[PDB]
Scaffold this active site. Structure first.
Site, PDB file in Angstrom:
ATOM      1  N   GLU A 164       0.824  -1.208   0.000  1.00 55.85           N
ATOM      2  CA  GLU A 164       0.000   0.000   0.000  1.00 55.85           C
ATOM      3  C   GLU A 164       0.859   1.259   0.000  1.00 55.85           C
ATOM      4  O   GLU A 164       0.562   2.219  -0.720  1.00 55.85           O
ATOM      5  CB  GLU A 164      -0.938   0.003   1.206  1.00 55.85           C
ATOM      6  CG  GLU A 164      -2.059  -1.022   1.136  1.00 55.85           C
ATOM      7  CD  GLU A 164      -2.755  -1.030  -0.207  1.00 55.85           C
ATOM      8  OE1 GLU A 164      -3.248   0.036  -0.635  1.00 55.85           O
ATOM      9  OE2 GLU A 164      -2.800  -2.105  -0.839  1.00 55.85           O
ATOM     10  N   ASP A 174       4.463  -4.346  -5.974  1.00 56.48           N
ATOM     11  CA  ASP A 174       5.162  -5.506  -5.428  1.00 56.48           C
ATOM     12  C   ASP A 174       6.675  -5.329  -5.505  1.00 56.48           C
ATOM     13  O   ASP A 174       7.381  -5.526  -4.509  1.00 56.48           O
ATOM     14  CB  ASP A 174       4.730  -6.777  -6.161  1.00 56.48           C
ATOM     15  CG  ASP A 174       3.375  -7.289  -5.694  1.00 56.48           C
ATOM     16  OD1 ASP A 174       2.966  -6.953  -4.558  1.00 56.48           O
ATOM     17  OD2 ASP A 174       2.722  -8.027  -6.467  1.00 56.48           O
TER      18      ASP A 174
HETATM   19 ZN   LIG Z   1      -2.235  -3.404  -5.254  1.00 57.01          ZN
END
Ligand SMILES: [Zn+2]
Ligand SMILES: [Zn+2]
Ligand SMILES: [Zn+2]
Lengths: 415, 416, 418
Positions: free
Chosen positions: C93, C141
């Site tokens: 996030e 990521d």
């Molecule tokens: Zn995401």
């Protein structure tokens, strides 16, 4: 002291009652009977003990009390009681036997197993008082009966209603064997009642609903909720008529005709969504036809869910029948601790712990049910199993073994 | 007769284990019984076996009862400056038994439970047994003779007696040792004379004594029974035996405080010098298991010289097997152990753990029953064996075993 | 545009407070921001302060919007077996905001500000939902796992969590809502394993704060599938010493929940004796004492803490103890300082309102209640309370001007957004 010794005997006898007599453990009927009984005790003189009121599923009329302010009332009292003040007069009579310590005096002056074996025989489908004992109990009873806001004339009206039934009937009401009723006693009851001012009091709506549930749901022998009574109640005062629809919905649900019970329950549910009586009936109709979720949603939205034990037990059970055992456990682990004597909570806790596959917690919840019923050796057996499925030294092992010790010390006090 | 007092002694021991805070440490109970049996080895008119129990209690006291069962409070370790003084207290108790002092006190007398409740109260940290001055005069005279025949210092008895009198002569409330064992000046004076009359003997306290003191004061911390660094600082300057025990004591507290890396390198020099010493091997396993190095603890104990003979090493290796995820090997040792030491509740509890890991439930219940039987909870033990007997076939050999053991426990109940 | 986004982010969190079920518990909010800020301190190109919010919701989800506000559903504690799995989701996030994915996505379109807020409130409430491109999820990521390892957590916890999400999206007919906002095709999963494998193995043990947070979240804020089950506590009782202490804490917590105060005291006793200064145990010991009407014992224990002047958890705990002890003036002195130093903490404003109610200072109670309503986005209601407060003080008084001044501020805040 002597209060302590007598409350220790009181607990022993209550356990024996739970193990052999057919007590009604209904949340609503237990709540009502004790709320009405406490109302009389709060206006009684010389109270040394807590009081608890017990209801037997017996169509023979009888009422008696023993050590520790424990009053036991046969459900047939609802059949004889036309109004709440009549039923209260019998309870006020029994509380007065306790405050006067009539039973304590007799045994003191001149066996524990002999007295306890009589108490079980009187409750299951003998102790007798002198005529001065009954004279003391009626006066002291009628004084606490009207300080509680009930009709004093209900006591002689109920006694004379008892005397009339005894004369014509083959066998007398069994209550008149424990509490003999000569015409002298009835005339004395009429005298003190007539000495006070007239008082026409409306029976509580809770009384009419309790009588409906007692006779409709716990029917037995002469304890029937007849179609005559309800057609009669359909024409009565504001409180009597909705008690009519409640009992009508009850046996419609008792006879597994749940669709019929829905349409009867509709208007009282819609008019009174916040009282526990139809909320309770509005859970049994839903679970009976596998509609558990809205029975949960309805009880989740109830105001007094965190105040009233009836809604808590109802919602805990709904979670169980709804396939949510953990939610039931969360409620019942706290309910069992705040209602240590309610065997319904221990049973439902065991059912939830069984569904969660927590075997030692289940066995432990079962044990408290067996201890409450006076089966101490059996409760110790279950806790020993529980203690054998947790590691030695754990928090649970020390708990189960300490509880075994308590039950063993409770056992030796009388054995 | 003698058979009843040995049986009555077992009853008092069982309820002692069930409620008094007994120390069940393998090294400590092995040392105190080894030292005690060494004294019984030189005592006269011994008609019973003897067992010595250690109680976590910072109040100094000692007493004995039927069946040759001697009870020693752990505080005796901080009062005993040398091994002969500690033995001086035991030989006193041992003589109380061979003279049957309490026995005759209870021959002139709900009576068994009355004394059991008294013995239990004396043992627990929170109506007490007292011996007459004649009994105490005999207990010192015969006791000092047992102590000389055992190869310790006879002068340790009066120095100990004088040590406690010099500290408690003025106190409003003396230690409990002087209530059970009254010490007037007359009894002290006679004790010092008989010690003066025999030969002088300067004995060095065994190595095992100084480390027993360190472990007792170290691992079984409680109250006034802390091992202050004051004693460890002093032992660091003492003799060759007290300096090793001093560094063993702080390696012990480093392990107690989860300072495992500090404990290994602190114990480091002692283990290299005596790699087959049980005290050092025991502590090394505690450090290894605290760091999840179970394999390293197993390999060290498997190479131990007297693993096949020493009960302390067998228990340590059985537990390491358990933490190492090898319950079967643990059970192979514990099954042999629990039959070689039937009264050792450490063996029975570890076997229960092994049998649980192996999911042999009737064998687990059977092992758990022994722990409950030794602690005086016979009904509970009978209950577990009934469950075990219900999980085996009717007519099976195991069912006959459990049913037969239930009979023994039930018969043990009806005697009392 | 940073100035617009951080005021727009304030509008959204106000809207969250007023309608989503936020967990406002001092210990948990402090933990989730302690760990969240620990990840931000190792993040790149951070232009914004960061706040992390916990929603009492048993459906696993997480999302973030303008002003560095990250929203985390409490279900995350149920799926997280270790502290680095939880941080992997938070780093994801935090990577969404530093890349300004939600900001850049909304610059393409251009009323609209409220349509986004209704989507955010629907995602947060248990009960039209934002989802990211495959480019965004790859960036979040790749960038996130680098933040996750700079912070000392296990980089393999990111691919291990992703596959844990997929492994119960095939076991159940239910697809976790986290995977609707953050799509997880097997290309993304293979990519996560690849970047983790390029970095070195790291065995990190979770903080003991994580296990206690997991215990407090599932035990005190239990809801639906979020439960502190006996199965969980038994496995923690068998694990490492941090899980054992947390299992002891969780059981003491549940005893306290069930009014088993004496049982709860015996259970917390060894943990509090071991570290008498631990906020989690000090917090629980207060609840136990106040449950048994033992305010004096609760007050005395919290006055002896080192971090009383520094730790907001202890400050609120002691203010509430003073309240139950019949010393509301001492509570107000703490809370007057607290609400001045923590303008956005609704707990301080509510307890101050209780203290001013106890001292019969009606206008000051009303102004404190108003702050609570203003923090929840209920500005007209807060204006209503301040208007009544202004009507109980003299015209021209200092109190009159302040109440009227804050009304001016709140109304000025109303016209900036619709
Ligand atoms: Zn995401
Ligand atoms: Zn009567
Ligand atoms: Zn002696």
């Amino acid at each position: 002291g002597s209060i302590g010794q007598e409350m220790q005997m009181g607990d022993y006898y209550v356990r024996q009652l739970r193990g052999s007599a057919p007590l009604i453990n209904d949340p609503l009927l237990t709540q009502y009977i004790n709320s009405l009984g406490m109302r009389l005790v709060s206006h009684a003189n010389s109270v040394k003990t807590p009081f608890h009121f017990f209801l037997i599923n017996n169509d023979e009329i009888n009422a008696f009390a023993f050590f520790g302010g424990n009053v036991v009332l046969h459900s047939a009292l609802f059949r004889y009681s036309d109004n709440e003040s009549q039923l209260a007069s019998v309870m006020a009579h029994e509380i007065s036997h306790v405050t006067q310590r009539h039973l304590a005096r007799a045994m003191e002056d001149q066996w524990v197993g002999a007295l306890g074996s009589i108490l079980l025989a009187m409750a299951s489908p003998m102790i007798s008082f002198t005529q001065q004992n009954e004279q003391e109990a009626d006066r002291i009873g009628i004084q606490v009966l009207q300080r509680s806001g009930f009709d004093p004339q209900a006591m002689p009206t109920f006694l004379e209603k008892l005397l009339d039934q005894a004369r014509y009937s083959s066998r007398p009401p069994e209550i008149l064997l424990t509490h003999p009723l000569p015409e002298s006693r009835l005339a004395d009851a009429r005298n003190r009642a007539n000495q006070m001012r007239p008082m026409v009091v409306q029976s509580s709506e809770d009384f009419y609903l309790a009588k409906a549930r007692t006779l409709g749901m716990y029917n037995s022998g002469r304890n029937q909720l007849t179609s005559d009574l309800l057609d009669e109640w359909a024409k009565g005062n504001v409180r009597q008529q909705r008690a009519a629809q409640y009992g009508r919905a009850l046996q419609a649900m008792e006879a597994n005709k749940y669709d019929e019970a829905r349409k009867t329950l509709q208007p009282l549910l819609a008019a009174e969504p916040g009282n526990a009586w139809y909320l309770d009936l509005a859970t049994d109709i839903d679970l009976g036809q596998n509609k558990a979720n809205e029975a949960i949603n309805r009880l989740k939205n109830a105001r007094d869910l965190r105040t009233n034990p009836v809604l808590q037990l109802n919602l805990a059970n709904a979670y169980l029948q709804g396939g949510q055992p953990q939610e039931a456990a969360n409620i019942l682990n706290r309910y069992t601790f705040n209602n240590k004597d309610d065997s319904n909570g221990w049973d439902l806790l065991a059912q939830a712990e069984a569904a969660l596959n927590n075997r030692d917690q289940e066995l432990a919840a079962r044990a408290e049910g067996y201890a409450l019923a006076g089966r101490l050796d059996q409760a110790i057996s279950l806790l020993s199993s529980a203690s054998s499925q947790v590691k030695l030294g754990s928090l649970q092992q020390a708990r189960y073994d300490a509880r075994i010790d308590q039950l063993r010390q409770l056992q030796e006090r009388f054995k």
